[PDB]
Amino acid sequence: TKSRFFSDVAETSSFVFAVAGADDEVVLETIRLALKQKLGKFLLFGKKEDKTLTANESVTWIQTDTAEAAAQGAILAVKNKEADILVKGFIPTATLMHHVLKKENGLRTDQLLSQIAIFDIPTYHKPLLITDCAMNVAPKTKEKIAITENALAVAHQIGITNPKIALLSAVEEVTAKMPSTLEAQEVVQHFGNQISVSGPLALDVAISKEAALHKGITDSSAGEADILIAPNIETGNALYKSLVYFAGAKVGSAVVGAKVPIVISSRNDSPENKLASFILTVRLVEK
Amino acid sequence: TKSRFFSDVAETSSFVFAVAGADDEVVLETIRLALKQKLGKFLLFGKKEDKTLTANESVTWIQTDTAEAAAQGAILAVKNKEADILVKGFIPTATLMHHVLKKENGLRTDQLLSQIAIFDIPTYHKPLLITDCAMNVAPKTKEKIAITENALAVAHQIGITNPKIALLSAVEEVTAKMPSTLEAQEVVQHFGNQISVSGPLALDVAISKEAALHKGITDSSAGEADILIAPNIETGNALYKSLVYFAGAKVGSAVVGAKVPIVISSRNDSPENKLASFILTVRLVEK
Ligand code: NI
Ligand code: NI
Ligand code: NI
Ligand code: NI
């Protein structure tokens, strides 16, 4: 038997999702699913109301004929404590973040923003957090620190014990030929022994006891990573997708580091994984 | 029912493997397995003979007390047409390649060398080639071309029809923020319509019809990639490992682009996957 982050017991909740661009089924489907299980309530900023959806007592529609004003309103709702979670609707991520990063809008803090995802992978025995798979493109040491910090906050917020973090690379030898290894090393040195952080580690070493041993790695944090820190966006994303498409993984994803959790789902995500993202952000709301 | 590259019918063969540093079980185990099914014959350059192994009529032992001379002999055996396949034994990859790349040793050609791997993934329906997962660290456009060229040669040599190639990235929007996308684009433009090459593509788009459609990608080469070209080593390697450790994949791997196929297996690989690498290189030998 394994540990699962997403159980068959529906998290319920009264938190408010502000949806920036509540249009198109790719956006609405997830909202329906949430309502079905009462995951929370919704503030919808959109062009064309779905009056079959907005009849729900937990739904309120805010007409916005502009993607600009759609992001703008959803952002302000959160700023004013009217919504707990920011959700990107049918608009570009660039448009949402342009407003999210606007300091006067008060969502930004000192932290780098980063995407993070939590996976239930049937061939793993516990939940796996992977970051950053969708936002930070080529983070260097400083950014990787912040990304790891955000991962830590997330682990703590959602009840992952004392997480084992693995800075991912292609090898565990630190070499000038492969900067990801060097940056991995310097991230590890930032934290020292404050947390269980290690790397550079290839993936096998990070999540397989057998592989570690075969590579002469003898501790008990190897093969048990709770959090992987991608070396670059392409690695994080490939990994994310292989888990979903080949490993049969269930995954919830969010952008963290702002005053509220942000959902930024992609067009390809299954309704189930997009719901899972809602659930994750609900689990991330600390009052 | 799916197509499998590695069948239950054992490829047999009379080709000769030259093993550079035939020592330690991590190296020998694979050789035993090959012998069991008569995959081919062996020229072993090693420190300490295994006389239980070398009694085999298909095995000949060449005493070498140096990793240097171990690589050196295995290389010369291939140069002289005494062996068909070069296998790295219990020595560093750096030591093997130092001799492999020595032009006077005649293994090198005009081509970039690259690692490539062929996967049978139960949740995919046909074999998947992924490159480069272990050698080229940060290939740019020129290198990615060569890598793709090597992939093409490999596809042709092993009977993969007209392969669909996908230049992998985190997104399909080409942007200056993410050079992998730009380089992907320029690789695609090198080939034009000579082959089915496309990208930048995130992984979902490359190997899932459903995902492509969800992203407004309407052809019939999407969701059917036969070959993925990694944007960088960390992505290729992560992908390789997730397939093995999470997707239950069977995988054979080789370094290609030299006069003979080269096996460079890692300490963590299962004996089965290492055998699979032997089989792949047997399949790669063209006389
Ligand atoms: Ni606490
Ligand atoms: Ni520091
Ligand atoms: Ni032909
Ligand atoms: Ni060109």
XYZ file of C-alpha atoms and ligand atoms in Angstrom:
578
model
C 0.000 0.000 0.000
C 1.154 3.490 -0.867
C 0.601 6.993 0.458
C -1.611 9.144 -1.800
C -1.925 12.928 -1.729
C -5.161 12.826 -3.729
C -7.582 10.501 -1.914
C -11.045 9.232 -2.807
C -12.304 11.443 0.006
C -13.192 14.784 -1.562
C -11.639 17.788 0.149
C -14.532 20.157 0.575
C -14.027 23.869 1.205
C -15.519 27.336 1.318
C -12.522 29.126 -0.214
C -13.137 31.432 -3.146
C -11.534 30.933 -6.567
C -11.149 34.095 -8.649
C -11.136 33.056 -12.312
C -9.489 35.456 -14.690
C -11.224 34.850 -17.999
C -14.067 32.486 -17.128
C -14.783 31.373 -20.689
C -14.474 28.219 -22.825
C -15.116 24.678 -21.593
C -11.384 24.058 -21.125
C -11.803 26.457 -18.188
C -15.384 25.836 -17.134
C -15.231 22.033 -17.045
C -12.917 22.142 -14.022
C -15.207 24.579 -12.262
C -18.196 22.267 -12.733
C -16.199 19.396 -11.240
C -15.247 21.468 -8.212
C -18.854 22.502 -7.660
C -20.022 18.904 -7.875
C -17.902 18.054 -4.851
C -18.256 21.500 -3.218
C -14.519 22.154 -3.412
C -15.280 25.867 -2.917
C -16.927 28.970 -4.368
C -16.204 30.988 -7.546
C -15.825 34.587 -8.700
C -15.893 34.518 -12.489
C -14.513 37.275 -14.679
C -15.616 36.547 -18.220
C -17.017 37.710 -21.532
C -20.012 35.402 -21.909
C -21.875 34.214 -18.821
C -22.836 30.553 -18.492
C -26.187 31.009 -16.807
C -26.496 27.264 -16.233
C -23.310 27.498 -14.204
C -23.938 30.864 -12.566
C -27.286 29.727 -11.200
C -25.211 27.829 -8.647
C -25.468 29.592 -5.278
C -21.688 29.271 -5.025
C -21.063 31.142 -8.266
C -21.033 34.866 -9.029
C -20.397 36.313 -12.478
C -18.433 39.499 -13.101
C -18.811 40.648 -16.703
C -15.464 41.514 -18.266
C -15.147 42.043 -22.010
C -11.369 42.271 -21.866
C -8.646 39.762 -21.078
C -6.869 42.748 -19.571
C -9.738 43.644 -17.272
C -10.359 39.930 -16.665
C -6.919 39.474 -15.158
C -7.203 42.929 -13.574
C -10.417 42.114 -11.716
C -9.445 38.643 -10.606
C -6.216 40.143 -9.240
C -8.031 42.923 -7.381
C -10.546 40.469 -5.906
C -7.635 38.582 -4.356
C -5.911 41.773 -3.289
C -9.096 42.780 -1.440
C -9.499 39.389 0.262
C -12.659 38.591 -1.698
C -11.042 35.533 -3.288
C -8.554 33.065 -1.830
C -7.148 31.494 -4.960
C -6.238 33.038 -8.315
C -7.100 30.958 -11.373
C -6.002 31.769 -14.907
C -8.986 31.335 -17.236
C -9.064 31.522 -21.024
C -6.248 34.058 -21.379
C -2.490 34.075 -21.896
C -0.256 33.407 -18.919
C 1.675 36.557 -19.919
C -1.469 38.612 -19.464
C -2.183 37.143 -16.029
C 1.358 37.517 -14.768
C 1.706 41.041 -16.087
C -0.878 42.018 -13.499
C 0.233 39.524 -10.853
C 3.768 40.993 -10.929
C 2.556 44.605 -10.860
C 3.795 45.476 -7.368
C 1.008 47.993 -6.697
C -1.383 45.059 -7.083
C 0.085 43.659 -3.876
C 0.233 39.991 -4.863
C 3.991 40.046 -5.287
C 6.330 39.649 -2.339
C 10.057 39.153 -1.910
C 9.914 35.625 -3.318
C 10.533 34.451 -6.836
C 7.348 32.961 -8.266
C 7.610 29.342 -9.390
C 5.462 26.512 -10.677
C 5.323 23.340 -8.604
C 3.476 20.051 -9.043
C 2.546 17.188 -6.787
C 2.283 13.729 -8.296
C 0.744 10.485 -7.152
C 2.655 7.959 -9.243
C 1.496 4.371 -8.900
C 5.061 3.016 -9.140
C 6.217 5.380 -6.421
C 5.161 4.867 -2.810
C 4.588 8.449 -1.721
C 3.666 11.828 -3.246
C 6.369 13.517 -5.350
C 6.786 17.241 -5.714
C 8.570 18.428 -8.833
C 9.596 22.057 -9.543
C 9.951 24.112 -11.626
C 8.254 22.502 -14.668
C 6.478 25.442 -16.344
C 7.653 28.911 -15.259
C 11.311 29.491 -14.455
C 13.066 28.719 -17.759
C 16.771 28.734 -16.963
C 17.091 29.423 -13.225
C 20.638 29.725 -11.933
C 21.787 29.197 -8.354
C 20.000 32.168 -6.770
C 16.721 31.271 -8.495
C 17.106 27.569 -7.700
C 17.451 28.515 -4.030
C 14.240 30.512 -4.143
C 12.563 27.693 -6.083
C 13.697 25.210 -3.461
C 12.514 27.610 -0.717
C 9.074 27.761 -2.348
C 9.099 23.981 -2.551
C 9.891 23.833 1.171
C 7.095 26.205 2.058
C 4.765 24.078 -0.042
C 5.875 20.816 1.612
C 5.335 22.334 5.015
C 1.984 23.864 4.084
C 0.624 20.525 2.823
C 1.960 18.271 5.567
C 4.965 16.655 3.943
C 7.131 15.864 6.974
C 10.781 16.815 6.517
C 11.130 16.642 2.771
C 14.077 15.108 0.998
C 15.110 17.430 -1.799
C 17.128 16.372 -4.798
C 18.748 18.813 -7.184
C 18.337 16.976 -10.483
C 20.960 16.628 -13.188
C 22.158 13.983 -15.681
C 25.045 12.830 -13.465
C 26.189 13.052 -9.855
C 29.736 14.158 -10.735
C 30.041 17.926 -10.461
C 31.782 19.124 -13.641
C 32.426 22.382 -15.503
C 31.188 20.613 -18.642
C 27.719 20.611 -17.061
C 26.779 23.845 -15.198
C 23.588 22.311 -13.855
C 25.878 20.169 -11.702
C 27.776 23.163 -10.372
C 24.615 25.134 -9.702
C 23.159 22.064 -8.034
C 26.174 21.937 -5.770
C 25.934 25.611 -4.823
C 22.229 25.275 -4.020
C 23.071 22.405 -1.673
C 25.802 24.498 -0.018
C 23.388 27.402 0.538
C 21.311 25.219 2.836
C 24.058 23.090 4.337
C 22.576 20.702 6.894
C 19.509 22.810 7.656
C 17.404 20.429 5.535
C 17.815 17.114 3.697
C 19.036 18.535 0.414
C 21.409 16.763 -1.916
C 22.618 16.776 -5.536
C 23.511 16.938 -8.307
C 21.650 13.632 -8.606
C 20.413 11.886 -11.697
C 16.790 10.846 -11.342
C 17.518 7.175 -10.705
C 19.552 8.089 -7.634
C 16.850 10.431 -6.371
C 13.882 8.053 -6.373
C 15.364 4.531 -6.405
C 17.141 2.895 -3.474
C 18.383 0.176 -5.838
C 19.962 2.684 -8.237
C 21.678 4.666 -5.506
C 23.242 1.495 -4.089
C 24.343 0.426 -7.536
C 26.076 3.817 -7.768
C 27.786 3.442 -4.385
C 25.436 5.856 -2.582
C 24.846 4.409 0.853
C 22.573 6.671 2.948
C 18.798 6.462 3.466
C 17.673 9.738 1.885
C 18.607 8.436 -1.537
C 15.768 6.666 -3.294
C 13.320 8.591 -1.125
C 13.260 12.111 -2.512
C 10.008 13.968 -1.702
C 10.979 16.968 -3.873
C 12.902 17.212 -7.140
C 14.328 20.575 -8.251
C 14.580 20.652 -12.005
C 17.854 21.904 -13.492
C 15.963 23.792 -16.207
C 12.351 24.099 -17.460
C 12.733 21.536 -20.253
C 13.718 18.818 -17.769
C 10.976 19.671 -15.309
C 8.359 19.719 -18.063
C 9.500 16.504 -19.780
C 9.466 14.793 -16.417
C 6.015 16.144 -15.624
C 4.666 14.895 -18.914
C 6.303 11.451 -18.828
C 4.740 10.887 -15.443
C 1.304 11.881 -16.698
C 1.415 10.168 -20.061
C 3.578 7.120 -19.413
C 3.513 6.572 -15.671
C -0.257 6.956 -15.279
C 0.378 9.717 -12.710
C -2.262 11.945 -11.121
C -0.893 15.467 -10.656
C -1.924 18.775 -9.145
C -0.015 21.927 -10.085
C 0.232 25.507 -8.890
C 2.277 28.667 -9.079
C 3.541 29.584 -5.629
C 5.429 32.430 -4.037
C 2.681 35.055 -4.276
C 0.286 36.121 -1.508
C -2.272 33.601 -2.818
C -1.887 30.284 -4.637
C -2.273 30.545 -8.401
C -3.633 27.933 -10.787
C -2.156 28.004 -14.264
C -3.339 24.930 -16.104
C -2.484 24.048 -19.664
C -4.792 23.199 -22.560
C -3.722 19.532 -22.533
C -4.410 18.728 -18.847
C -7.174 16.251 -18.100
C -10.152 17.612 -16.180
C -9.055 15.304 -13.372
C -5.556 16.799 -13.176
C -6.965 20.317 -13.418
C -9.320 19.546 -10.536
C -6.290 18.144 -8.763
C -4.665 21.562 -9.215
C -7.717 23.194 -7.586
C -7.418 20.758 -4.678
C -3.727 21.467 -4.292
C -4.352 25.223 -4.140
C -7.142 24.700 -1.649
C -4.665 22.696 0.427
C -2.231 25.609 0.044
C -4.513 28.321 1.403
C -3.364 29.176 4.920
C -5.507 31.654 6.871
C -1.508 -5.116 -29.106
C 1.636 -3.051 -29.439
C 4.813 -3.163 -31.495
C 7.896 -4.188 -29.480
C 11.526 -3.687 -30.476
C 12.717 -6.227 -27.906
C 10.820 -9.482 -28.517
C 10.751 -12.778 -26.639
C 12.602 -14.225 -29.616
C 16.305 -13.928 -28.834
C 18.360 -12.269 -31.551
C 21.289 -14.591 -31.987
C 24.515 -13.482 -33.657
C 28.159 -14.168 -34.372
C 29.338 -10.561 -34.004
C 32.271 -9.873 -31.719
C 32.060 -7.575 -28.686
C 35.351 -5.985 -27.630
C 35.115 -5.236 -23.904
C 37.406 -2.545 -22.625
C 37.980 -3.440 -18.992
C 36.354 -6.852 -18.616
C 36.224 -6.831 -14.820
C 33.608 -6.659 -12.040
C 30.202 -8.350 -12.142
C 28.507 -5.096 -13.179
C 30.282 -5.744 -16.494
C 30.459 -9.523 -16.599
C 26.822 -10.221 -15.715
C 25.681 -8.815 -19.066
C 28.239 -10.905 -20.900
C 26.973 -14.091 -19.243
C 23.426 -13.223 -20.303
C 24.501 -12.675 -23.896
C 26.343 -15.991 -23.956
C 23.320 -17.808 -22.573
C 21.329 -16.790 -25.632
C 24.336 -16.809 -28.005
C 23.974 -13.102 -28.752
C 27.573 -13.148 -30.039
C 31.234 -13.648 -29.150
C 33.581 -11.699 -26.828
C 37.097 -10.264 -26.762
C 37.820 -9.349 -23.155
C 40.482 -6.883 -22.093
C 40.817 -7.147 -18.338
C 42.964 -7.345 -15.233
C 41.685 -10.561 -13.664
C 40.447 -13.380 -15.887
C 37.198 -15.159 -15.042
C 38.198 -18.655 -16.070
C 34.643 -19.903 -15.566
C 33.584 -17.388 -18.189
C 36.588 -17.683 -20.490
C 36.153 -21.436 -20.801
C 33.284 -20.563 -23.133
C 34.328 -21.309 -26.721
C 32.946 -17.889 -27.643
C 35.194 -16.047 -25.203
C 38.843 -15.017 -25.467
C 40.732 -13.201 -22.721
C 43.320 -10.504 -23.369
C 45.235 -9.667 -20.195
C 45.457 -5.922 -19.628
C 46.628 -4.527 -16.299
C 45.785 -0.963 -17.262
C 42.524 0.851 -17.900
C 44.543 2.771 -20.465
C 45.700 -0.338 -22.287
C 42.252 -1.882 -21.759
C 40.582 0.860 -23.759
C 43.586 0.922 -26.103
C 43.317 -2.764 -26.990
C 39.563 -2.888 -27.323
C 39.817 0.113 -29.661
C 42.549 -1.483 -31.775
C 40.626 -4.765 -32.012
C 37.743 -2.840 -33.571
C 40.059 -0.811 -35.764
C 41.498 -4.075 -37.126
C 38.072 -5.630 -37.760
C 38.579 -8.261 -35.060
C 35.586 -6.982 -33.086
C 32.291 -5.556 -34.319
C 31.067 -3.751 -31.240
C 32.953 -1.682 -28.664
C 31.852 -2.138 -25.059
C 33.034 -0.003 -22.161
C 33.911 -2.293 -19.244
C 34.876 -1.332 -15.704
C 36.568 1.957 -16.606
C 35.666 5.630 -16.886
C 33.825 6.807 -19.972
C 36.465 9.564 -20.247
C 39.162 6.931 -20.578
C 37.277 5.041 -23.288
C 36.409 8.122 -25.295
C 39.897 9.554 -25.046
C 40.993 6.655 -27.218
C 37.808 6.469 -29.286
C 38.243 10.130 -30.318
C 41.956 9.750 -31.084
C 41.729 10.187 -34.858
C 44.719 7.932 -35.586
C 42.689 5.153 -33.966
C 40.320 5.390 -36.922
C 37.031 4.998 -35.059
C 36.146 8.655 -35.436
C 34.537 9.996 -38.589
C 32.969 13.283 -39.620
C 29.976 12.758 -37.337
C 29.417 14.010 -33.836
C 29.173 11.068 -31.450
C 25.926 10.829 -29.492
C 24.110 8.537 -27.099
C 20.744 7.179 -28.195
C 18.242 4.847 -26.543
C 15.344 2.764 -27.731
C 12.468 2.167 -25.346
C 9.604 -0.280 -25.262
C 7.132 1.522 -23.015
C 4.003 -0.431 -22.161
C 1.806 2.693 -22.303
C 3.164 3.576 -25.723
C 2.236 1.525 -28.781
C 5.539 1.472 -30.632
C 9.278 1.734 -29.892
C 10.559 5.192 -28.900
C 14.022 6.482 -29.618
C 15.286 9.235 -27.349
C 18.564 11.167 -27.840
C 20.823 12.491 -26.486
C 20.389 11.346 -22.849
C 23.977 10.749 -21.679
C 26.700 12.317 -23.851
C 26.087 15.672 -25.505
C 25.554 18.023 -22.542
C 24.399 21.302 -24.049
C 24.200 20.771 -27.821
C 23.257 23.833 -29.839
C 21.721 23.861 -33.310
C 24.680 22.405 -35.221
C 25.079 19.580 -32.692
C 21.331 18.935 -32.549
C 21.381 18.501 -36.330
C 24.156 15.941 -36.095
C 22.356 14.264 -33.185
C 19.178 14.109 -35.237
C 21.202 12.793 -38.215
C 22.611 10.018 -36.018
C 19.089 9.280 -34.840
C 17.979 9.016 -38.473
C 20.791 6.665 -39.364
C 19.851 4.566 -36.352
C 16.145 4.474 -37.282
C 17.029 3.400 -40.781
C 19.569 0.821 -39.623
C 17.054 -0.847 -37.282
C 14.014 -0.796 -39.550
C 12.006 2.109 -38.204
C 10.056 3.180 -41.296
C 10.050 6.938 -41.855
C 10.553 8.212 -38.347
C 8.669 11.119 -36.870
C 11.139 13.325 -35.050
C 10.204 15.782 -32.354
C 12.543 18.458 -31.072
C 11.597 18.541 -27.395
C 11.105 21.643 -25.284
C 8.797 22.854 -22.481
C 6.478 24.739 -24.855
C 5.642 24.916 -28.551
C 5.895 28.722 -28.732
C 9.301 29.749 -30.041
C 10.599 32.479 -27.709
C 13.867 34.275 -26.938
C 13.177 33.553 -23.261
C 13.799 29.875 -24.048
C 16.718 29.199 -26.463
C 15.870 25.515 -26.680
C 12.795 26.642 -28.614
C 14.825 28.723 -31.039
C 17.403 25.999 -31.546
C 14.573 23.530 -32.019
C 13.174 25.745 -34.733
C 16.503 26.062 -36.542
C 17.032 22.294 -36.459
C 13.627 21.851 -38.092
C 14.516 24.438 -40.756
C 17.791 22.647 -41.552
C 15.837 19.620 -42.726
C 12.782 21.351 -44.141
C 10.420 18.772 -45.626
C 13.083 16.141 -46.275
C 11.846 14.205 -43.222
C 8.990 14.359 -40.701
C 10.661 16.675 -38.225
C 8.821 19.137 -36.044
C 9.240 21.227 -32.878
C 9.711 22.828 -30.488
C 7.169 20.444 -28.961
C 6.491 19.715 -25.335
C 6.426 15.990 -24.661
C 2.646 15.717 -24.447
C 2.329 17.021 -27.997
C 5.011 14.653 -29.255
C 3.582 11.349 -28.026
C -0.127 11.992 -27.373
C -2.745 12.542 -30.069
C -5.161 13.745 -27.378
C -2.744 16.400 -26.093
C -1.901 17.724 -29.538
C -5.597 18.141 -30.360
C -6.202 19.850 -27.051
C -3.438 22.272 -28.075
C -4.942 22.912 -31.515
C -2.398 20.749 -33.372
C -4.297 18.981 -36.112
C -1.976 16.780 -38.221
C -1.250 13.049 -37.888
C 2.459 13.111 -37.028
C 1.675 14.607 -33.648
C 1.139 12.016 -30.949
C 3.175 9.560 -33.003
C 6.784 10.626 -32.607
C 9.251 7.754 -33.198
C 12.250 9.884 -32.134
C 12.620 12.602 -29.506
C 15.620 14.960 -29.630
C 16.386 16.199 -26.161
C 16.974 19.938 -25.751
C 19.816 19.278 -23.301
C 21.343 16.276 -21.467
C 19.395 16.816 -18.237
C 16.066 16.505 -20.066
C 17.115 13.464 -22.055
C 18.431 11.736 -18.937
C 15.446 12.567 -16.706
C 13.163 11.283 -19.423
C 15.212 8.120 -19.824
C 15.072 7.446 -16.120
C 11.370 8.221 -15.629
C 10.577 5.741 -18.357
C 12.703 3.053 -16.736
C 11.744 3.670 -13.137
C 8.157 4.878 -13.388
C 6.899 3.717 -16.760
C 8.207 0.151 -16.466
C 10.109 0.668 -19.742
C 12.601 -1.751 -21.291
C 15.446 0.174 -22.931
C 18.531 -0.480 -25.015
C 21.167 2.241 -25.343
C 24.225 2.932 -27.460
C 26.679 5.586 -28.526
C 26.498 6.067 -32.278
C 28.337 8.039 -34.909
C 31.603 6.082 -34.815
C 32.695 3.333 -37.220
C 31.287 0.727 -34.804
C 28.432 0.852 -32.295
C 29.546 1.533 -28.734
C 27.945 0.317 -25.522
C 28.315 2.633 -22.560
C 26.119 1.342 -19.778
C 25.780 2.890 -16.362
C 26.197 1.296 -12.938
C 22.451 1.504 -12.219
C 21.133 -0.283 -15.345
C 19.405 -3.612 -14.839
C 21.105 -6.624 -16.403
C 18.065 -6.827 -18.669
C 18.480 -3.265 -19.956
C 22.221 -3.768 -20.365
C 21.552 -6.906 -22.404
C 19.049 -4.823 -24.323
C 21.913 -2.439 -25.124
C 23.948 -5.385 -26.469
C 20.985 -6.392 -28.634
C 20.569 -2.869 -29.934
C 24.242 -2.687 -30.935
C 24.003 -6.078 -32.582
C 21.022 -4.725 -34.517
C 23.178 -1.706 -35.415
C 26.073 -3.625 -36.944
C 25.851 -3.284 -40.720
C 28.368 -5.277 -42.776
Ni 4.631 23.444 10.896
Ni 24.065 31.301 -0.344
Ni 17.071 1.433 -46.477
Ni 21.454 24.355 -41.881
